[PDB]
Amino acid sequence: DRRALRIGVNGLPPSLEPINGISNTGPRIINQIFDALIRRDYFADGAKGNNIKLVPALAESFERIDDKSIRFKLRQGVKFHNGAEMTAEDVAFTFSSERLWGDEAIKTVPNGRNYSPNWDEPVVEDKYTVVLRTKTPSYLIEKYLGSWLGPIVPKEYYKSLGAVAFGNKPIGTGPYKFRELVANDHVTLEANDGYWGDKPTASTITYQVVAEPATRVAGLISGEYDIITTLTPDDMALVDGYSDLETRGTLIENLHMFTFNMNQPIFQNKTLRRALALAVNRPLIVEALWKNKASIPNGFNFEFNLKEAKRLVKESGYDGTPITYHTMGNYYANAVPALMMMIEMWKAAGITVVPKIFAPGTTPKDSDILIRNWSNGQWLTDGLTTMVSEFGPGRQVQKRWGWKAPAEFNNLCDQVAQLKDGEERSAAFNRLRDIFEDEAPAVLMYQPYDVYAARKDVQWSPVSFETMEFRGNLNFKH
Numbered sequence: 001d002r003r004a005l006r007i008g009v010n011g012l013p014p015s016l017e018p019i020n021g022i023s024n025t026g027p028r029i030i031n032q033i034f035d036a037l038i039r040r041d042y043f044a045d046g047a048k049g050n051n052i053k054l055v056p057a058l059a060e061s062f063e064r065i066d067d068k069s070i071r072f073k074l075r076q077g078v079k080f081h082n083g084a085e086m087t088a089e090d091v092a093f094t095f096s097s098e099r100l101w102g103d104e105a106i107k108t109v110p111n112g113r114n115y116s117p118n119w120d121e122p123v124v125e126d127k128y129t130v131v132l133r134t135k136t137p138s139y140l141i142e143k144y145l146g147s148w149l150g151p152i153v154p155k156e157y158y159k160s161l162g163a164v165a166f167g168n169k170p171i172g173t174g175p176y177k178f179r180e181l182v183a184n185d186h187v188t189l190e191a192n193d194g195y196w197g198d199k200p201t202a203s204t205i206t207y208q209v210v211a212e213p214a215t216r217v218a219g220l221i222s223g224e225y226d227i228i229t230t231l232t233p234d235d236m237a238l239v240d241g242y243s244d245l246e247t248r249g250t251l252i253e254n255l256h257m258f259t260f261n262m263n264q265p266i267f268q269n270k271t272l273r274r275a276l277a278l279a280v281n282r283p284l285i286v287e288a289l290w291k292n293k294a295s296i297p298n299g300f301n302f303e304f305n306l307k308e309a310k311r312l313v314k315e316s317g318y319d320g321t322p323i324t325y326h327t328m329g330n331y332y333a334n335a336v337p338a339l340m341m342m343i344e345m346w347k348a349a350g351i352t353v354v355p356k357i358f359a360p361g362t363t364p365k366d367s368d369i370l371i372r373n374w375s376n377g378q379w380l381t382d383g384l385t386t387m388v389s390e391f392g393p394g395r396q397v398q399k400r401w402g403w404k405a406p407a408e409f410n411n412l413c414d415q416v417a418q419l420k421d422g423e424e425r426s427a428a429f430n431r432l433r434d435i436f437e438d439e440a441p442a443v444l445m446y447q448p449y450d451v452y453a454a455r456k457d458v459q460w461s462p463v464s465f466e467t468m469e470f471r472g473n474l475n476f477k478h
């Protein structure tokens with residue numbers, strides 16, 4: 001029999017419904033349960049897990065018709081885990097108004113429209129042929145369909161349950177099928193021996209929440225886990241002297257940041273937000289805590305000034321009231337050590353910030369949040385599109401977190417979705433970046449160097465994204 005794989009994780013997603021589970025913790029599970037029309041071939045052409053190449057997966061082939069539509073020829077005989085055959089009806093449902101982007105859909109799939117292009121309703125042409133299309137021109141459709149938007153869901157089963165219940169009992173076409181969920185504890189998957197692609201190599205995969213990185217390292221050493229997630233470069237020393245273990249790391253296409261609840265009076269205006277941003281010496285943090293392996297971003301592409309931060313603190317009228325910084329422990333690698341360094345930096349600017357460490361499983365009330373840490377996946381190669389997906393008009397930073405973005409910012413967000421790459425689009429990018437930095441609705445810290453640790457007897461390479469790929473990349477040694 002095949003070996004059981006045990007993964008010690010930083011957390012579980014709130015749902016296994018593909019869109020509702022988008023987070024640092026979901027894709028590593030969702031990628032196993034589902035397939036998309038298109039897969040990212042991370043290891044193509046000898047790449048070290050970072051190739052952006054997209055290849056056919058549930059679509060056997062596809063051909064663009066015009067600037068707003070693509071015809072897909074689906075792979076035949078593919079079965080969902082309940083035995084139902086995957087047809088054009090399921091692909092059309094996946095990208096339908098009813099499930100994904102309509103007004104009613106987004107009440108149970110809240111980011112269905114935010115993470116989509118401007119879809120029009122899919123057209124089913126025959127059992128294995130579907131046209132996916134946008135209402136306005138888009139040369140990103142294939143990219144969206146190969147992203148975390150893309151998992152194909154079973155129409156009849158999904159409709160019978162609704163998105164919330166489907167998220168607790170998912171059915172997909174992927175190499176591992178859902179077995180069990182214990183909230184805040186684990187998810188167990190089992191091999192899908194009916195898989196259409198390469199046969200799964202593990203009998204079961206268990207994702208077990210172990211909140212603290214030191215405790216995860218101890219469980220790898222003790223033999224409780226085969227792979228552990230969400231470590232830092234500094235954790236590499238803790239594995240010194242274990243011949244059977246190693247670290248495996250890579251830069252990933254994710255930005256660690258901090259952000260604000262701009263409904264709060266102290267953060268309704270930009271002045272103090274920008275002071276908090278300018279006070280941070282990001283190179284010092286990268287040197288200190290990341291062994292210079294994390295990467296300071298060039299904005300949202302796929303300045304430390306303490307003098308100006310002090311000036312803005314005084315201009316803001318800030319009165320010395322302690323400002324909390326909410327962090328779910330070290331859910332983000334290096335969260336608490338980085339916060340400690342930033343608290344020192346903020347003190348030097350005249351701002352008192354204190355940690356508010358909350359437990360795994362707890363969702364603070366939005367009204368208790370002043371500053372919080374967060375991350376954003378860079379989930380398409382087009383960084384403008386992913387920035388807009390969180391910071392644009394009607395998206396969550398404005399709608400939920402109260403950022404009163406300048407009208408010009410919102411105007412340019414709309415313009416860049418219609419412009420082709422070139423001079424005008426890059427000029428809009430530059431101006432959006434300047435406004436974003438002036439407004440400081442969030443502050444980008446760095447792209448983390450994601451570190452896993454694993455048994456040498458489990459052959460598996462990381463990829464440059466907040467997920468785990470096992471296709472062609474999970475072999476057990478004797």
Ligand SMILES: *OC[C@@]1(O[C@H]2O[C@H](CO)[C@@H](O)[C@H](O)[C@H]2O)O[C@H](CO)[C@@H](O)[C@@H]1O
Nearest residue numbers: 013014023024328331361362363373374
């Ligand atoms: O980036 C995901 C995010 O959410 C996770 O944590 C919150 C708080 O416990 C849960 O409500 C979500 O279900 C879970 O995915 O992580 C940070 C916290 O570390 C939140 O700000 C994000 O929404």
